[PDB]
């Protein structure tokens, strides 16, 4: 064992020096005088009440009109974001849930929390009720996130270090991703559904391959736990948010850190990060009761989403870019535009 | 200005909101408690006594004087609790069971208790501290084979305070030792209470005729002090 660390350190710092040689110009210098986005004014259009406890996660539908949110009182509610009507309200078996996902096909919703179980609900069925279809129980840690791949494929992230690809029909995990050293907190799928990135409590982010169980790449730029990760619409870059008032941009090709979105006036820690449809705007939700708007190419604060009472927990931008939703711990969803 | 279908859409949303209101009644009339501690401490014995009288979360229900309590015991989970503890930010109280029989773990327990008390997401949350298996503690100390001063070399200098109120039938040696650990836990509790949360230690045992009643009286005090502080009275 003593003959391994000596050469592992040499390999690691070789990687480090090759990485240093790879980069030659800061992206801030490249995008130095192209265009400022200017001040951005966004205001509430609808406010969605009806959640008893606080809410942790929410996911936009693909039709850009429906969204689903999960609360600490054990409730899944599907909204009509146009007419504010409550399309569906689902009671959960476990009151502690930390994530929810909406299927791209629009007929499946999934949730899971401190029960180490990811449950699947089918919205459209011959009978007039939303019920459980499959209960994936193979983890030994709380589920931190989940994302649908198709109508029968899903990837889950657990408090247990492993990330697992599942198979709804057979109810068995096809592939297990074991590369981290702590608890994976978030995972963001690629637009082509071929390579997702996950962030953990070890300040490290890893790009994976769905076809096999191989960790393709690893990024380490932060010092605290990684709390939220998002993928750039182009599919060749991604931004993350950690518990040190900092957001960073990594490129899956250059393998560097491009910008550091932070300000001396911020002490709180990020909770959710999302991108605009064009990728020009970065939206980050903080713990100081309000979200923020960042210029993804100039690294400036160009907008604040002031209205919220408690800490924001989930943030998201709809597929067509019409609006951005925002949940928080005061149990109110606000659609901004 | 709405179609004949949107009228029935709004009607459905009203009956969703009506059912949510009915569910707000049960949610507001129940108190949620979180069990914590270590493996040696007889938490399973505690939950088995009330319940008779890779899941990762176990929930048990008990109600005394027509008010419902729900206790959530964390099941199969990893050692680290940094992340999933911020979720329990709205419980009324934490029930922190501790075993007093063996002396090696006591130092470990103080490390566990100190981190929970000083946590950022658990301020304004009071701890109903328990000391369990007290009968076995008496047996070990009266035998005298195992000393206390070897682990904590202050048992000799320290003397039982006048505030101690022991029942008849117990020698001073048991009372001197029993109240020594209780003050050790409180030594770190008083430092960071900061007029927000309070500790309510007890001296329960493995099997007890009544245990929930201690939680009832502590919970009533816990929120009575919260309301009084809220109305600028306390």
């Amino acid at each position, epitope marked *: 064992l003593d003959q391994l660390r000596q050469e592992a350190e040499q390999l690691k710092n070789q990687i480090r020096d090759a990485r240093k040689a790879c980069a030659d110009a800061t992206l801030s210098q490249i995008t130095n005088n192209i265009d400022p986005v200017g001040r951005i004014q966004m205001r509430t259009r609808r406010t969605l009440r009806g959640h008893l406890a606080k809410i942790y996660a929410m996911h936009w539908g693909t039709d850009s*009109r*429906l969204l689903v949110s999960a609360s600490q009182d054990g409730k899944l509610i599907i909204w*009509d974001s*146009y*007419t504010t*009507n409550k*399309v*569906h309200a689902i009671p959960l078996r476990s009151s502690w849930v930390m994530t929810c996902a909406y299927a791209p096909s629009g007929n499946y919703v999934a949730c899971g929390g401190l029960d180490n179980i990811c449950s699947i609900y089918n919205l459209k069925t*011959r*009978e*007039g*009720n939303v019920r459980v279809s499959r209960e994936l129980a193979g983890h030994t840690g709380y589920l931190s996130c989940c994302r649908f791949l198709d109508d029968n494929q899903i990837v889950t992230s657990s408090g247990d270090t492993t990330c697992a690809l599942w198979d709804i029909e057979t109810g068995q995990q096809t592939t297990t991703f074991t590369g981290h050293t702590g608890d994976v907190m978030s995972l963001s799928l690629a637009p082509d559904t071929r390579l997702f990135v996950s962030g953990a409590c070890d300040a490290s982010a890893k790009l994976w391959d769905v076809r096999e169980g191989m960790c393709r790449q690893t990024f380490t730029g932060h010092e605290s736990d990684i709390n939220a990760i998002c993928f750039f619409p182009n599919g060749n870059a991604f931004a993350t948010g950690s518990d040190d008032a900092t957001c960073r941009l990594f490129d899956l090709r250059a393998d560097q850190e491009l910008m550091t979105y932070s300000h001396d006036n911020i002490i709180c820690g990020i909770t959710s990060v999302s991108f605009s449809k064009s990728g020009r705007l970065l939206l980050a939700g903080y713990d100081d009761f309000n979200c923020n708007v960042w210029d993804a190419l100039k690294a400036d604060r160009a907008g604040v989403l002031a209205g919220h009472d408690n800490r924001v927990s989930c943030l998201g931008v709809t597929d067509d870019g019409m609006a951005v939703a925002t949940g928080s711990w005061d149990s109110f969803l606000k659609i901004w535009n | *200005t709405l*179609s*004949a*279908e*949107d*009228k*029935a*859409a709004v*009607e*459905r949303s*009203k*009956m969703i909101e009506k059912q949510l209101q009915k569910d707000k009644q049960v949610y507001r009339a129940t108190h949620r408690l979180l069990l914590l501690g270590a493996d040696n401490s007889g938490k399973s014995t505690i939950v088995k006594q009330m319940r008779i009288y890779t899941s990762g979360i176990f929930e048990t229900k008990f109600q005394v004087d027509k008010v419902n309590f729900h206790m959530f015991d964390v099941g199969a989970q990893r050692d680290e609790r940094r992340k999933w503890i911020q979720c329990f930010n709205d419980v009324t109280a934490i029930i922190f069971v501790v075993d007093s029989s063996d002396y090696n773990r006591l130092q470990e327990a103080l490390n566990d208790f100190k981190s929970i008390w000083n946590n950022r997401w658990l301020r304004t949350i009071s701890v109903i501290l328990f000391l369990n298996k007290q009968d076995l503690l008496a047996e070990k100390v009266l035998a005298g084979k195992s000393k206390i001063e070897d682990y904590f070399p202050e048992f000799a200098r320290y003397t039982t305070p006048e505030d101690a109120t022991p029942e008849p039938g117990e020698d001073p040696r048991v009372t001197r030792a029993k109240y020594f650990i209780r003050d050790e836990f409180l030594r770190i509790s008083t430092a960071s209470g900061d007029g927000r949360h309070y500790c309510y230690p007890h001296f329960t045992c493995s099997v007890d005729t009544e245990n929930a009643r201690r939680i009832f009286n502590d919970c009533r005090d816990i929120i009575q002090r919260m309301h009084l502080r809220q109305y600028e009275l306390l």
Partner: single-chain antibody, 231 residues
Framework: VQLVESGGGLVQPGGSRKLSCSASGFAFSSFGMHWVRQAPEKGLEWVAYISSGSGTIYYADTVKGRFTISRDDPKNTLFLQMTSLRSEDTAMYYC??????????????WGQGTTLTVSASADIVMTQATSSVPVTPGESVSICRSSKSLLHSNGNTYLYWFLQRPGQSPQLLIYRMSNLASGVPDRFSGSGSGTAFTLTIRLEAEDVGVYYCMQHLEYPLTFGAGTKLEL
């Protein structure tokens, strides 16, 4: 999802009768319920409507005030009480379930009447152009009767296309003129111009039967005259 209808029988011209539609296999408490009449030798017409939870109730102006529609969720049964029957009310009755929310498909399940034979304005009219068109397997058949623009401000159309197999209950084919109902093959593409509509089909051997439409924009639900396809 299977609901049966009970009642019927020989009745006197002036008496009373009770009609029941007992639901089973679905969450009956979250479904609006309608009643639709179908004359022995004519088209189908609306009768009544009771919302889920009995919040709102409408009636047909033809027999308003002589009929009552009531629910029973505990027992999952629907009732219709008829008083002072006349010769016009002689037909077969269908209880049609429908649920209304974003993306729903109302009027999807009907259920056939079992021995349901009985004895003796500013609306929208949907008199279809034809009543019979020759059909052979291989060629499409299609034929718009709207007295008002069936296009609300939201963006929908509110035209439902039903098909009547010869000898049993109707079925839903297309709702809102562009949405194909579940459980039926490719029978329509999506085409309409606010006031003119058509239903283009390859014809198989089961398509024979009446083929009429409906309106849902305003409170009265007026059906089409009826188009038939024969081999």
């Amino acid at each position: 999802v299977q609901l049966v209808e009970s009642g019927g029988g020989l009745v006197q011209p002036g008496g009373s009768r009770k009609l029941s539609c007992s639901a089973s296999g679905f969450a009956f408490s979250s479904f609006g319920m309608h009643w639709v009449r179908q004359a022995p030798e004519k088209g189908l017409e609306w009768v009544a409507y009771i919302s889920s939870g009995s919040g709102t109730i409408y009636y047909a102006d033809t027999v308003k005030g002589r009929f009552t529609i009531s629910r029973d969720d505990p027992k999952n049964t629907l009732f219709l009480q008829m008083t002072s029957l006349r010769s016009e009310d002689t037909a077969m009755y269908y209880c049609v379930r429908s649920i209304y929310y974003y993306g729903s498909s109302p009027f999807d399940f009907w259920g056939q009447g079992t021995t349901l034979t009985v004895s003796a304005s500013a609306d929208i009219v949907m008199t279809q152009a034809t009543s019979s068109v020759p059909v052979t397997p291989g060629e499409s058949v299609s034929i718009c009767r709207s007295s008002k623009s069936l296009l609300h401000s939201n963006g929908n159309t509110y035209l439902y296309w039903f098909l009547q197999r010869p000898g049993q209950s109707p079925q839903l084919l297309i709702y809102r003129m562009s949405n194909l109902a579940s459980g039926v093959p490719d029978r329509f593409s999506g085409s309409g111009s606010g006031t003119a509509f058509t239903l283009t089909i390859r014809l198989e051997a089961e398509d024979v039967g009446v083929y009429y439409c409906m309106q849902h924009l305003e409170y009265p639900l007026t059906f089409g005259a009826g188009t038939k396809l024969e081999l």
